[PDB]
């Protein structure tokens, strides 16, 4: 639907949509920009991520509300209210899966294969792990283990690159470690791995802060605090 709009206009409108908190529009504009076939700059990758994280975040929050109602509906002593709660949870779930499949499709056609620099490749592989993680959050069937393994594999490739090619304070590296640690805790039933990863990431970043400017220090310490927040919650 965005094929007739200039790439630069799509990027401009994505930024306007962000200012207006119109994240569905923002995501549609950024999808259009990706489909122009050119690589994304750092700023453009961030716009893509912000847009879809906000869209799926709303869907995930709604899914959790509905899933909890459905759970309570199926306890002993609860009254049969019909198929409606399940139907509506399924509707939201299918829409969420559709957004995840769209993002994964953009990554596969063809953002990842053209991404050669560590900053872009790690960013996109992190995103791939994230959207498989969101699929795993709602999965229950024959392919659930395979969805979890797809998330794990993308995160692991991103980790391997990030450790070789980025400093331990790099914000992308830090955010990847944060999210892979959440994957371990919440998805893979591996709380010890989650804690170990968060701790080693935090400690290795702390030791590298001395190399940074004031502005980079602020960026890195912000994400380190998210790691610390999880460690405090989990221990």
């Amino acid at each position: 639907a965005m094929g007739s709009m200039e790439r630069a206009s799509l990027i401009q409108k994505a930024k306007l949509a962000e200012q207006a908190e119109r994240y569905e529009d923002m995501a549609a504009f950024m999808k259009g920009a990706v489909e122009k076939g050119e690589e994304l700059s750092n700023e453009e990758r961030n716009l893509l991520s912000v847009a879809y994280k906000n869209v799926v975040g709303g869907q995930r929050a709604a899914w959790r509300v509905l899933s909890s109602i459905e759970q309570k509906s199926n306890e002993e002593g609860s009254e049969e209210k019909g198929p409606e709660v399940r139907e509506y949870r399924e509707k939201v779930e299918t829409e969420l899966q559709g957004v995840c499949d769209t993002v994964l499709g953009l990554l596969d056609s063809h953002l990842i294969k053209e991404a050669g620099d560590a900053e872009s490749r790690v960013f996109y592989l992190k995103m791939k792990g994230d959207y498989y993680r969101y699929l795993a959050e709602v999965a229950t069937g024959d392919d659930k283990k395979r969805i979890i393994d797809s998330a794990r594999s993308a995160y692991q490739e991103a980790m391997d690159i990030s450790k070789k090619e980025m400093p331990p304070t790099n914000p992308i590296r830090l955010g990847l470690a944060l999210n892979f640690s959440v994957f371990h805790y919440e998805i893979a039933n591996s709380p010890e791995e989650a804690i170990s990863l968060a701790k080693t990431t935090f400690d290795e970043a702390m030791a590298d802060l001395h190399t940074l400017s004031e502005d980079s220090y602020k960026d890195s310490t912000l994400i380190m605090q998210l790691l610390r927040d999880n460690l405090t919650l989990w221990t």
């Binding site: 994280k53 975040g57 955010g175 944060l178 999210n179 998210l226 927040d229």
Partner: peptide
């Protein structure tokens, strides 16, 4: 308190 992921 919900755990943090990268927003």
């Amino acid at each position: 308190r919900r755990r943090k992921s990268c927003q």
